[PDB]
Amino acid sequence: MSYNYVVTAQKPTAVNGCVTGHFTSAEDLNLLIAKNTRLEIYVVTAEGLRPVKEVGMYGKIAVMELFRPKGESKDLLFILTAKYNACILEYKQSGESIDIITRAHGNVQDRIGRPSETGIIGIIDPECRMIGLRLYDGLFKVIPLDRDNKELKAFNIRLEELHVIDVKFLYGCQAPTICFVYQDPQGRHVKTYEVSLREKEFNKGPWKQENVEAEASMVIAVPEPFGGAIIIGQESITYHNGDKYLAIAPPIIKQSTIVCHNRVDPNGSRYLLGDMEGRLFMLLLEKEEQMDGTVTLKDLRVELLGETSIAECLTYLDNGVVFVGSRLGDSQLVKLNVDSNEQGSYVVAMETFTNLGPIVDMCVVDLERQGQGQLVTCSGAFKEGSLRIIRNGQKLHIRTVPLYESPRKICYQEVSQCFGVLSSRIEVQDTSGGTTALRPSASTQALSSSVSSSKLFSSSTAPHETSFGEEVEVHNLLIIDQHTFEVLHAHQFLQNEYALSLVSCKLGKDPNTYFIVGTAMVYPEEAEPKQGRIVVFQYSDGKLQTVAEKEVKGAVYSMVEFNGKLLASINSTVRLYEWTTEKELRTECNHYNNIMALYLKTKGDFILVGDLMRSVLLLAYKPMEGNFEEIARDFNPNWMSAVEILDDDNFLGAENAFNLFVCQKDSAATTDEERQHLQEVGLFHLGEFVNVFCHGSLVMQNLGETSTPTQGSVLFGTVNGMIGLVTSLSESWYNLLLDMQNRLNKVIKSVGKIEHSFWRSFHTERKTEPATGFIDGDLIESFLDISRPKMQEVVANLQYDDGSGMKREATADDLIKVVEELTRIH
Amino acid sequence: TESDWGKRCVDKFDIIGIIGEGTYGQVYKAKDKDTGELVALKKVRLDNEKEGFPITAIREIKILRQLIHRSVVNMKEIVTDKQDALDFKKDKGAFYLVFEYMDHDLMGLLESGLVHFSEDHIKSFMKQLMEGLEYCHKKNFLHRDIKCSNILLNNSGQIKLADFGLARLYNSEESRPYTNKVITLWYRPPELLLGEERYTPAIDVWSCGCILGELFTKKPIFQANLELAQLELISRLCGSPCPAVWPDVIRLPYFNTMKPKKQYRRRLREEFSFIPSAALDLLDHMLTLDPSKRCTAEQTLQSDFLKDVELSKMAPPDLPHWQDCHE
Amino acid sequence: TKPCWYWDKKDLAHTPSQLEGLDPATEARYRREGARFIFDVGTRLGLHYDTLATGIIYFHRFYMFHSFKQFPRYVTGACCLFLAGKVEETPKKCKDIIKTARSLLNDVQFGQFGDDPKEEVMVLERILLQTIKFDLQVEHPYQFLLKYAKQLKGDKNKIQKLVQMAWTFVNDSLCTTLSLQWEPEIIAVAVMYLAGRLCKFEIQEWTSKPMYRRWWEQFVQDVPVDVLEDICHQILDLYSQGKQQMPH
Numbered sequence A: 001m002s003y004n005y006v007v008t009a010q011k012p013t014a015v016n017g018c019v020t021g022h023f024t025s026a027e028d029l030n031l032l033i034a035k036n037t038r039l040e041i042y043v044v045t046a047e048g049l050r051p052v053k054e055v056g057m058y059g060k061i062a063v064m065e066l067f068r069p070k071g072e073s074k075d076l077l078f079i080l081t082a083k084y085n086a087c088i089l090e091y092k093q094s095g096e097s098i099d100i101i102t103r104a105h106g107n108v109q110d111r112i113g114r115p116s117e118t119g120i121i122g123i124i125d126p127e128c129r130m131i132g133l134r135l136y137d138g139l140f141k142v143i144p145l146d147r148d149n150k151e152l153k154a155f156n157i158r159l160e161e162l163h164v165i166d167v168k169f170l171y172g173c174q175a176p177t178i179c180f181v182y183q184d185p186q187g188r189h190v191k192t193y194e195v196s197l198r199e200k201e202f203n204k205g206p207w208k209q210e211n212v213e214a215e216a217s218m219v220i221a222v223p224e225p226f227g228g229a230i231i232i233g234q235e236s237i238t239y240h241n242g243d244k245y246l247a248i249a250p251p252i253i254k255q256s257t258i259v260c261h262n263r264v265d266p267n268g269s270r271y272l273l274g275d276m277e278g279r280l281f282m283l284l285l286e287k288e289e290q291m292d293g294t295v296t297l298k299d300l301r302v303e304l305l306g307e308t309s310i311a312e313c314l315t316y317l318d319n320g321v322v323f324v325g326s327r328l329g330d331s332q333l334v335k336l337n338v339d340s341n342e343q344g345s346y347v348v349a350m351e352t353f354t355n356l357g358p359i360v361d362m363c364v365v366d367l368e369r370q371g372q373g374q375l376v377t378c379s380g381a382f383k384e385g386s387l388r389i390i391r392n393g394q395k396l397h398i399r400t401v402p403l404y405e406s407p408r409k410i411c412y413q414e415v416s417q418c419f420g421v422l423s424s425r426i427e428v429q430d431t432s433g434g435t436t437a438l439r440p441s442a443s444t445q446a447l448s449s450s451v452s453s454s455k456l457f458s459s460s461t462a463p464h465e466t467s468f469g470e471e472v473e474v475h476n477l478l479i480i481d482q483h484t485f486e487v488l489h490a491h492q493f494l495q496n497e498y499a500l501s502l503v504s505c506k507l508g509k510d511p512n513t514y515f516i517v518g519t520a521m522v523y524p525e526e527a528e529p530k531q532g533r534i535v536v537f538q539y540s541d542g543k544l545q546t547v548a549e550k551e552v553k554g555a556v557y558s559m560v561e562f563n564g565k566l567l568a569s570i571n572s573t574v575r576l577y578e579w580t581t582e583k584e585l586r587t588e589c590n591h592y593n594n595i596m597a598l599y600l601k602t603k604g605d606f607i608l609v610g611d612l613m614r615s616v617l618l619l620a621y622k623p624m625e626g627n628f629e630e631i632a633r634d635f636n637p638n639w640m641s642a643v644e645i646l647d648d649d650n651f652l653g654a655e656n657a658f659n660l661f662v663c664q665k666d667s668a669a670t671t672d673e674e675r676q677h678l679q680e681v682g683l684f685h686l687g688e689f690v691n692v693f694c695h696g697s698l699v700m701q702n703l704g705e706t707s708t709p710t711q712g713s714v715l716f717g718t719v720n721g722m723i724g725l726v727t728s729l730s731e732s733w734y735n736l737l738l739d740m741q742n743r744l745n746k747v748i749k750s751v752g753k754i755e756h757s758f759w760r761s762f763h764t765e766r767k768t769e770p771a772t773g774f775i776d777g778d779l780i781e782s783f784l785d786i787s788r789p790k791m792q793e794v795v796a797n798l799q800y801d802d803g804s805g806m807k808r809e810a811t812a813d814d815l816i817k818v819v820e821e822l823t824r825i826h
Numbered sequence B: 001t002e003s004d005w006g007k008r009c010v011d012k013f014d015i016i017g018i019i020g021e022g023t024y025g026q027v028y029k030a031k032d033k034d035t036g037e038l039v040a041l042k043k044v045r046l047d048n049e050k051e052g053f054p055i056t057a058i059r060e061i062k063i064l065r066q067l068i069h070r071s072v073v074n075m076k077e078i079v080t081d082k083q084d085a086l087d088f089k090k091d092k093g094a095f096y097l098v099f100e101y102m103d104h105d106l107m108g109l110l111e112s113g114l115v116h117f118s119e120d121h122i123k124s125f126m127k128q129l130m131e132g133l134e135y136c137h138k139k140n141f142l143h144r145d146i147k148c149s150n151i152l153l154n155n156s157g158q159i160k161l162a163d164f165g166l167a168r169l170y171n172s173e174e175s176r177p178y179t180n181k182v183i184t185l186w187y188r189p190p191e192l193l194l195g196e197e198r199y200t201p202a203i204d205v206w207s208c209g210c211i212l213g214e215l216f217t218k219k220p221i222f223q224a225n226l227e228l229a230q231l232e233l234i235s236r237l238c239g240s241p242c243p244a245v246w247p248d249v250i251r252l253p254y255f256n257t258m259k260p261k262k263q264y265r266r267r268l269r270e271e272f273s274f275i276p277s278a279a280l281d282l283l284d285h286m287l288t289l290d291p292s293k294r295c296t297a298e299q300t301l302q303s304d305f306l307k308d309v310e311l312s313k314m315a316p317p318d319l320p321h322w323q324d325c326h327e
Numbered sequence C: 001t002k003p004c005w006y007w008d009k010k011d012l013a014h015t016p017s018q019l020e021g022l023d024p025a026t027e028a029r030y031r032r033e034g035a036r037f038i039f040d041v042g043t044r045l046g047l048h049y050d051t052l053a054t055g056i057i058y059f060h061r062f063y064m065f066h067s068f069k070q071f072p073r074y075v076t077g078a079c080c081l082f083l084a085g086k087v088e089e090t091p092k093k094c095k096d097i098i099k100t101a102r103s104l105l106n107d108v109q110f111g112q113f114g115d116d117p118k119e120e121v122m123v124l125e126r127i128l129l130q131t132i133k134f135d136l137q138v139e140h141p142y143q144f145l146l147k148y149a150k151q152l153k154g155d156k157n158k159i160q161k162l163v164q165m166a167w168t169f170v171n172d173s174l175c176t177t178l179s180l181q182w183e184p185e186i187i188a189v190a191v192m193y194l195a196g197r198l199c200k201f202e203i204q205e206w207t208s209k210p211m212y213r214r215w216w217e218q219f220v221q222d223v224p225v226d227v228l229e230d231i232c233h234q235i236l237d238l239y240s241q242g243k244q245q246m247p248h
Ligand SMILES: O=C(CSc1nc2ccccc2[nH]1)Nc1ccc(Cl)cn1
Pocket: A593, A614, A633, A635, B018, B019, B020, B039, B040, B073, B099, B100, B101, B102, B103, B104, B105, B108, B152, B162
């Protein structure tokens, strides 16, 4: 068996949702920001936000909504986790003591059902009579909000429309009414139903179905003064309400997809809209009052306000202040002005909240020779693309290098006092027949620049037609100085060439240090690329020289230096190249029992290959023979997102279901088959999507720092900005910390009353297993924050083993010291 | 001649890697040196000398050399390790069962969740499986181990049945005592949970229905670890075993012994409302508690869901592509 | 695709056994003894008639590729029965076959099994499988005797007498190389033909074509009487050579 310890070094920073209401008091204006597994509660002031409370939940927050049922003084909070844990929460404050109440809770998972494409949707009735959930295709689940439903019991109503895009409860209806957009073979439609709690079924809805735009994406529930709904698409915005129908199709929105909406004026006059290019719009509802005294919707207008970060959620707070919740870039407070500035913008940034964004790749390097080590991450996407230099100093110090294009891979080249960074920027087919970039970015603002002139694929004769307005990716290699972080050089790769892998190394007997990039020829027609290049560059005297190029029949997904040789994975093949005295790559050996070789890692003469669906494979280079040997493979099937070698026997992997596993060689040679079987001995749910595993630690080392019981250091980066650390334990230390977890879980009160053991259970759509071989470091570290009565309750009857003393019951002070040492690993 | 099995050496294949660990030995993918055709070689070890050649392999050799079908896997030949010269008693070299290499297996594709089955894809997939099952059932052979893992699928969209290790002949006239526990618990029929021991070909039909539902939900329908627990899950959806729905349930050994918590009513149509009507009927019949009332393989092929499916259009599934790898 | 398991009578002059100096009578005697050993061992163990026949067919086929002087028959017989049990799903443990083989064989005969009887047998399994070219499925005259008899309609008692007499002839043909000369379907017809002659029954009357004097042609196409007579002659020879007479 194997024993490991995982701790969160930096919490998730990306904003996954945000709502406003009256949650902490019926009087205050609150902003609740949801980051993966984390809830942040703020109070709105005239200058910005006053933080008041932050809690963690044992689950990914999927639905977050505030509502106020009749009889309550203040808003209640509904949350549903991605594993279908539902709860209703209340804020309660006693002087200085702040706690969160679990008013109702339960798990709403169905034994049988098909998870929907557009994900979990949760909505609440304007009269707060029920909670609507769209979890499975063809089913609508209703949790009625009666006082007695403390377990959140619910029923399903059969829904004929199998493929639903979005749904909202409507305002101004005689009965609870849902309005939704759905897709069938004839296109997309908007349709209504009424929800009867008494009959537990749908009844005919207030207004007829209307055919809507093919890419109709979002449903906006208009308030009582107008009523009805608004439907946002790629080209058009439409208003529907019985006999009334409006449509505005302003050319400005066709340019970028609109992803988020919020209401500015409670009466529905003004709504905010944002798009993937970061533009912020105002949608205006122009009113017309008839002599009847009735108020109707006259027309819709769209007005461009300015630019914000690409935003997952928008929420208007008060006055001119809007909170911009960003998942791909830094989140913001911005102020909307009535008068535009001299550039024509009505939006002016107030504050910027650091978001490490998607961490596509990262490397740990000691820049200042401090021995502390600094972490440089490829963070953000598109305009928010950035390099982030992170050091420990008690908070983490983070520096941001704006790139305004997507960073893909990073590697450090000390000989050149610089970094190599792979990047891509979006250009659009223009009237010249070429393409034009939407904005300048790192690859265009380099001091010196170059473009590949390779003739390898120039024979072509394969047609790829271009339509004006279509997007293309332009991939580049950036040379960036390690002190100034100034773009010294940008190399633009071939048209339709995507850069996938990057290394910096010396090969063979060649004393020069090279940047080597693996690329793939990507054409929309191909499901898998059939062409590629391995390119050897030298960065010398401010210029990048093309040294050599090797043509491969596929995509060079991953590369890694292997004892003076170049190990590269091309599609299904893992291939080792030698670097000749003629400065050209030479094929040595190949391996082909791979569906798609996505990730490579090396230790000694051993190699670990991560397949798209075949888990991990342990290979070995046999120098006596000049070929590869399959040592052992993990037959259990998992989808791989990132891998890492822990030691010669333990191997770490990341599943696309946000799960983590560790396999080990069976080390029992009884039968050859046992050795060729990798047994998964560690299973952990984690809750985040790992892209990059990287050996290293950020802790300052003076060579005198007490060696912690934990041994080894692997840092990992994730899509939501969370950075964690994986380390190994001895059997004795694991058993102790594990026994302590079970004691802590009985003591610590969970938000939503979610069992910790369930949260960490390895979980796929198909399987659920109890965690094994992993210690939740964050649970262990919370021991220091629980009250003294609870600490002593935890240590009761807790004895030591396999130590200097074989049985030695610890005290609350003994454990405080142990955990405090464990907090010094990050 | 092509018919002289057991003599050609495994030298004739250049092994690529290991594709899985089987029951009598590991199975390694390999390339034929002479033709280039990819094959998968199942290793059979007689070195154990406990009972000699595994009967599991003997069954697969006997049955698959009889069965010829597009949807049933082909044993191309049997090859051997370099045998010891003129000393059979010292010889302990293994034997290999060469089969065609099918690119992927359904359990693996579903586990990644990358694949997205449409109704038409399922139609093509289910039609082949049922046609293959019908051929085998008409030849009076029972598979007895129907699992997602034992369903191999080329990228082309062709399906083939695979592990005939537990397969045996069925005699309608003479009831024969068989092995109670054969199919994996997740796909095992209810009759065998209660231990019929004298089971019909309908046991394979039950599993294929569990597969049919699985393709629609992207999740095995009945997942449990204990035989009684499976009966409960099956009972919740298909209804509790009772004399009215299963007149002969009382004769089954464990009927009194193994009981669900309640006498649950059948809810299959309700819990599967999302499934298309044509397919939902197929599921209700395939997941019928009483083996005598459970549909046959031919009846599934003469269903509205499958009868008008044309095998000319195989409907290749959405197999994971490079953009599918991209996040 | 599939191998040829049938030879011409003239070919049996050239088995390995013949060419190593064994005369035709001795190889014939050696086959009867080996077949009957397989029959007797399995009957004591309670084995189905198909399992006995399958082992016997393996046995007969084996010594078309090998010599009796280098492969002791009784070891081979035991090995064939051992494999036959697994093929036909009537399995037995090798130790039990040895136990029964020891019970029935004297001390000289059991000396063939050498110092370790189980090992000599289990080892032979490798050669047997390669020799029979892994063609394990075998059909026997029994199933055709019944399939064809079921299509006869008439005096219940005259037909049952025909079947049992023919069934006995099938059991007796397992001691001969007929298994190596003619498909089982022909054997089943030949034994029906023989019993019909002996019981003075006219089988055509019981068929759906009562005026079709060559009654067998509706069961087995392309069989001349030449063949059925050659088979009958060979079966009755066993009775004349021995002391036993036709069952009647
Ligand atoms: O199992 C397959 C290919 S899919 C696969 N390759 C792997 C490689 C490593 C690990 C798992 C794998 N799964 N083919 C097959 C199945 C049965 C027969 Cl008889 C012949 N060929």
